[PDB]
Every structure is written in structure tokens, then in C-alpha cells.
Design a protein around this ligand. Structure first.
Ligand SMILES: O=C(O)[C@@H]1CS[C@@H](c2cccs2)N1
Ligand SMILES: O=C(O)[C@@H]1CS[C@@H](c2cccs2)N1
Ligand SMILES: [Mg+2]
Lengths: 412, 411
């Protein structure tokens, strides 16, 4: 029936680093990747900081010429994907290229490119719109360009489920493998929404922290003084592989992907229900998918965005799903350090969950100085905590009330 | 693996504001293409397209709700509401966890982004709508539909450019087949007819510039074709597990038996001349369905009226079907509707289902002089009544992303 799926390669760009090891080093050290934004003038904006990718060199991956045609979200997605494939040791050949697919998504996609082309249109006229505008801006072009560059001929698609994108991308890619549509998938997400429209759009909704004087303290999930999320950029990609395929080529296996859950809240467009009912159904779906007792869960990488309503909803959802075991597991939000990578959040957080398994350590929730009312679980405040972790869960919730949960397990 | 049937359909297209009106146009060989009226294209090289005419969002949403939502979302919701109504499905506490949605778009909220860009550049960030982000992102058709109807099953959105509608329907069917849902609303929507859209595709020289005869512009496989015609709209299907459908006495249009995907891994905006990726995709879909290629009677082609694209599809069909390529009928309804981009696969799935219901191959209009090698039965000019037990619908998109759906008569 259903085939087993393992993780054999990972890649990342984040506010903490230009690859996985550097990012993870920052995570375990409790380092913030958040700083005043330097690439544009935000004097007129209520939020002037976020998580930028620092010192990205696209020329390690693509020619300058090729890169100029592509929005940053595509460049970031390609970088993460190339890293992951290299990390996997996979060799693409005529014998396997039809069995290797890609599903790299984004929540917002090419907003910066669209903005720049809109500026050209309004100020100069339609003949200043780039000939590469459409292919350089649409969300499926990470999958498109990766497939072209590596020669991948398997299932080729992209999800866009807002802040849940990365999680859904990885889960659905795993389903393709489990049900025999592919043997390998490169999956994850990328995001670069740090332009006027992005900061201004989230600003207009009053969704962002406005702690401009102390950006590194802004993202503080479950803390009583939290005041909205921190906008961040980057990408995560995983090479998912059928177990026997991985074993046959002597691949290094990080972990097994054992469970995937989805649900819809059917509640509100931008706010979760206070009781976290949809998130609870999603996690339960994922645990039953994995054939697990909830007591087997050791670590949860929370969605944990540093919003008042969101953070408390997750606590409620975890208490509902896990009962008294909610007090035995460890749960943390790495968004405390990275900020919120939107569509890429689930991808980078899947990577962190896998590394939590590899290194047997719960990443910290930094800035958790004063836990809010009811936020009385082990939230790994301040410092990384070495502990036994056999099963790790990663949650993402997004606009439209779209939920995703991934369950990873140590592989023996 | 559980069987999946189609129990409801909905549509907005250049030919009509619902399925029956659109299908009437298709069978009559009507063009939905006309000079664009909603903006000033005097300075553009292409000034026509397929618009949705006389859309009344207040049949579906309050004025307040509508003001928050980009047109592509309005179109998607309209098609979705129609399809759910057409299905007769009753959502209850007992089944709401088993009903999901996967409605996608290729480009999404270009018009809304354009309008907000004006506020940003002329006034600054403080004039950006508080609803800008949720009202513009692609997953909001799925989001809003789930909220309005109380659907708590799988909730997601595909964005695979011109293949979106096809992939959305295919992956939704997989959810049902493998037990993740009993019902899914699936398809796509698009409204890219703004300065950025016309200007963007214009800058790439991808559009027909036959401004003097807009209804003759979309001419798939014709020697005088000169690019695609940009169109707007939406399609949605209610997909349902067979026993679930039977239990409530649903009207079943057809069965969805196969879904294939592939990547060309060739070029960003052009397929390979031999259509190798499309061929692999169709073969995958047929194997998924457990069908011999000789069982295929009708193909609703991607058929965009681009030089490279059209010929690649013929080559792919010849490769997959061999001598049977001369027995089947293939047509492009884009000859009449133009190219609905992300919604193309959704409306074309609907047309394939209706081809099965009515036992008729829709025409490829404007096919006056077939190009070299385009010597299959392309149903030139007029609808052709024939036996159709199995119908295939193809979509190919930027990045070389391919999808094929296989539908069969349900007895
Ligand atoms: O990631 C985020 O910042 C947002 C806010 S918390 C979550 C939602 C759940 C339901 C609607 S919005 N997504
Ligand atoms: O739908 C369209 O108009 C375009 C052109 S034909 C198809 C492609 C296949 C491979 C890359 S582009 N998509
Ligand atoms: Mg921080």
C-alpha cells in the first residue's frame, strides 16, 4: 500500500544564515535575525524592521543575467532547492529523472517585481514592462526553473496557502511519493514580501509589531507584551525520498516523515478561533495519519507568530490534542529568532524540526520574559534544551483558516 | 482507491455567466472575444480579449464583502457557489469535516495589486487597504468559500500558471480517492485583464495582435495563428466519492478516472517541438486510469493558438496514440473562449464532461488552413456528434508544467 518517505537533503536561506548549518547555529545560540530594513526607505511606515537575508550571492547558483529576470522569492527558492539537492547526494540521470518532481510554493510570490513593474507602467508607460515580467513573478517558477536547471521531469507544481504554504508543500509532496507518483520530491517554500505593498499591506491590517526601537525583542511568542508578527524573508527546501530508493543509493537519512494533516477552520479570513479548534483537528489528523499515541510527541515547532490571538489559540489546540501530555512535551517558536517567513515559514520550520531530531535538542523561544495568562506549557524559554526527541511535530496556520501539520520521527 | 464522480459544475466565461449558457455558445461555434471595454488600451498592441460580460457579484456576495475581494476571487466564488448549488449537496455538522476546497489561479490579484500600487506611489503606505493582503492572495477563494459554507476538509490552492485548473481538479480527486475527503470543490479562476497583464504578455509578444478581427484571432493549428487571446473567468467542479454520491441520490455527470502530471524540464515559456513532456503526461494519466490509448475518443486540447505550442501538442498526441491518433477527435475550445490561463483547465474539464453528456465534440473554430503536420481530426468549424466514452483534457504551462485529466461516461 503506502510507501515510507524520508528526508535526505535540506537547504535554506534565512535571516540567520545563507545555509542550513549557519541558520541552525543561530537557532541553537538564541540569535535574532531581526534588524532595521536597509534595502528601502520605511520612514513613512509604522514598521521599519524585519528579517532580511544578508549577503545573498545569487551568482553561486545562477548567472547575473538569469538572476535579473527573476524576483527575489524565486532566487531564494532556487538557492534553497539547489542546496537541498546537493546535500542529498542525488544524481539525476535518464534512469530516474521522470521519478523526481518539485513542489516549491509561496504565500505572496513576486510582489516586489509586480510593484516595480507597476511603477514602470504608471510613471513611464506599458512599453517599460519587462518582457520577463510574467515568468519572473509567478509562484510556480521556482518549480519550473529548478526542473529546467536540474532536468527533473516528475510532478511539477506549486501550492499557495499563505502562511501554511511550506507545510502543505512538504506534506503533499510526501503523499506523491507515498502513493507512487514519484520517488523523489524537492519541496518547501520561499518568500520575499519586504516591499512597500507588503510592509504597507500588513501594516494597514495592524498585524505587524511596531517595536521599532528594539527590533530583536519584537518577536516574542506567548509573551504578555507581544504586539504582532515580524515580517521575514527566505526559503527552505527538503529532498523527500521513498525509503527503499534512499537505502538503494546509500543516502544519508535525517528523519522519516510519518504524518501529514490538513484542516480548514471555516471561521474567519485573518483570525484563528480562540479555542484553536481547526488546529486541533489538523494535529489529530496528522497523528492518526502517523498511527501515533499523542504521548509519543516530544517536540512541537509551533506556528507561534507573536500575535495575541494566534499564540493563545495554539496553546488551547495543544492542550485539547495532548491533554496532560501537553505538560511533558516541549513546544517552541523559532519565529522568536527568524521572524515570520510567511509561505517559507513551514519549510524552514520543518528543517528545524528535523534538526531537533538529529541533534536531540529543543530550540528556544527567545524573548519569552513573562508568559501570558494560560501559556503555562514548556515553551523552552530563552535557551535551547537538550532532551529526548523521537517524534517532532511542525504546525502552520494561515489566512483563510488553512491549517497544516507535519509529523517527523527518528529513523533507525 | 475510491471512485470519484462529478456531481456539480459552475462557470463564468466569455461565452456566459453559467455552464448552460457557455456550453450553448461552444456548440454554436460562438466567439466570446471582443474589444476590451473596461480599460483604455488605445496605446497597446492588443486591445481585445475574452471578458466576463454583465457579472453581478451581488447575486453571491454583499457589496461590502465584494469590495474586499479581487475580481479573480469574485469569479472563483461565483463558479464555486454555482457548482455547490448544482450538486444539491447539503453541508451539515455530520459531513463538514469531509468537504474541502482547492480553487487556484495562475496570476491571482493583479488588478488589486495595481490599484493599491496607485495609492502607494501617489500618497504612500497609509492609503493601502487593511484587506489588501487577504483580498488579493490566491488561496482566498478556498478560504472564503470554506468560511461561507462551513467546509472544514482539506483547504488549499494550486498555482501552476496555465495548468492550474487541471492540477487543482486532479489533486482534489486524489484527496477523495485516498480518503482524505468525500467531497471537494475544485477548479480555478483568473482576471489578468489589466495594464500589467496585457502589457506583460504584450512585452513578451505572446498575444495575438489581430485587432481588426478579434473573433478570428484565436485560431489553434491554423497557419496564420500569431499568439494567444487573453481571457477571464472561472470554473468549478464538485467532485464526490461514488458511494457518497449514490447514497444521497446525486445526479452524476461523469467519472474522473485518471490524472497525470509531468515536467518538460526544457524552457520557461516554450514547449519542446516534439511535445515529449505532454506525451509523458498523457501516458501517465492513461496508466492512472488503467486505459489503453485506443479507448480515448475526444481530447480537449490545451491548443492556445501559439506557433510552437499547437504543433507540440499534435506531436505529443501522435506519439501517445499512434495510428489511433487518426480515429480520435481533438479540439481547442480556446478558439472560442480564448485562454483563461489558470481557469483554462477548469472550464475545459467542464466542456470535456459535457462532451460526454451530449456525445458531441466541440469545434475548433477559425481553423481555415491547418498548418503543416496538423492533419488530425481537429473538428474544424462545426461541432461533431460522435461516440465519446472517454475524454481527455490537457493543460501545459510556463515552467513546462503539464497536467492531463481523463473522464469517462458513468453508467
Ligand atoms: O501566520 C499568521 O500570522 C496568520 C495569523 S495566525 C494564522 C491564522 C489562522 C486562521 C486565520 S489567520 N495565520
Ligand atoms: O498556455 C500557454 O499559453 C503557454 C504556452 S504553451 C504552454 C507551455 C508549455 C511549456 C512551457 S510554456 N504554456
Ligand atoms: Mg528576534
Amino acid at each position: 500500500s503506502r510507501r515510507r518517505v524520508v528526508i535526505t537533503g535540506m537547504g535554506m536561506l534565512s535571516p540567520l544564515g545563507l545555509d542550513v548549518p549557519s541558520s541552525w547555529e543561530g537557532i541553537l545560540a538564541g540569535r535574532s535575525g531581526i534588524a532595521p530594513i536597509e534595502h528601502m526607505d520605511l520612514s513613512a511606515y509604522s514598521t521599519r524592521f524585519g528579517g532580511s537575508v544578508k549577503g545573498f550571492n545569487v551568482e553561486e547558483y545562477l548567472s547575473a543575467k538569469e538572476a535579473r529576470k527573476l524576483d527575489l522569492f524565486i532566487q531564494y527558492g532556487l538557492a534553497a532547492s539547489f542546496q537541498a539537492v546537493r546535500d542529498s547526494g542525488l544524481e539525476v540521470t535518464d534512469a530516474n529523472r521522470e521519478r523526481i518532481g518539485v513542489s516549491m510554493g509561496s504565500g505572496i510570490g513576486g510582489l516586489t517585481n509586480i510593484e516595480n513593474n507597476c511603477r514602470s507602467l504608471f510613471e513611464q508607460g506599458p512599453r517599460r514592462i519587462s518582457p520577463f515580467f510574467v515568468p519572473g513573478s509567478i509562484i510556480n517558477m521556482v518549480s519550473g526553473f529548478l526542473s529546467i536547471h536540474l532536468g527533473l521531469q516528475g510532478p511539477n507544481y506549486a501550492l499557495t496557502t499563505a502562511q501554511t504554504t511550506g507545510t502543505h508543500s512538504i506534506g503533499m509532496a510526501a503523499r506523491n511519493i507515498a502513493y507512487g507518483e514519484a520517488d523523489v520530491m524537492v519541496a518547501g517554500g520561499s518568500e520575499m514580501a519586504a516591499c512597500g505593498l507588503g510592509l504597507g499591506g500588513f501594516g494597514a491590517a495592524r498585524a505587524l509589531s511596531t517595536r521599532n526601537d528594539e527590533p530583536t525583542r519584537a518577536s516574542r511568542p506567548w509573551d504578555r507584551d507581544r504586539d504582532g508578527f515580524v515580517l521575514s524573508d527566505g526559503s527552505g527546501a527538503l529532498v523527500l525520498e521513498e525509503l527503499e530508493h534512499a537505502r538503494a543509493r546509500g543516502a544519508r537519512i535525517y528523519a522519516e516523515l510519518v504524518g501529514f494533516g490538513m484542516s480548514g477552520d471555516a471561521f474567519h479570513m485573518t483570525a484563528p478561533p480562540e479555542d484553536g479548534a481547526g488546529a486541533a483537528r489538523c494535529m489529530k489528523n496528522a497523528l492518526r495519519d502517523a498511527g501515533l499515541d499523542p504521548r509519543q510527541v516530544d517536540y512541537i515547532n509551533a506556528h507561534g507568530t507573536s500575535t495575541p490571538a494566534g499564540d493563545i489559540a495554539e496553546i488551547a489546540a495543544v492542550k485539547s490534542v495532548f491533554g496532560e501530555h501537553a505538560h511533558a512535551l516541549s513546544m517552541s517558536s523559532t519565529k522568536s529568532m527568524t521572524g515570520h517567513l510567511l509561505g517559507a515559514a513551514g519549510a524552514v520550520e520543518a528543517i528545524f524540526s528535523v534538526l531537533a531530531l538529529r541533534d536531540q535538542v529543543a530550540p528556544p523561544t527567545i524573548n519569552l520574559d513573562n508568559p501570558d495568562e494560560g501559556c503555562d506549557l514548556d515553551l523552552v524559554a530563552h535557551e535551547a534544551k537538550p532532551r529526548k526527541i523521537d517524534v517532532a511535530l511542525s504546525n502552520s496556520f494561515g489566512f483563510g483558516g488553512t491549517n497544516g501539520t507535519l509529523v517527523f520521527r527518528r529513523f533507525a
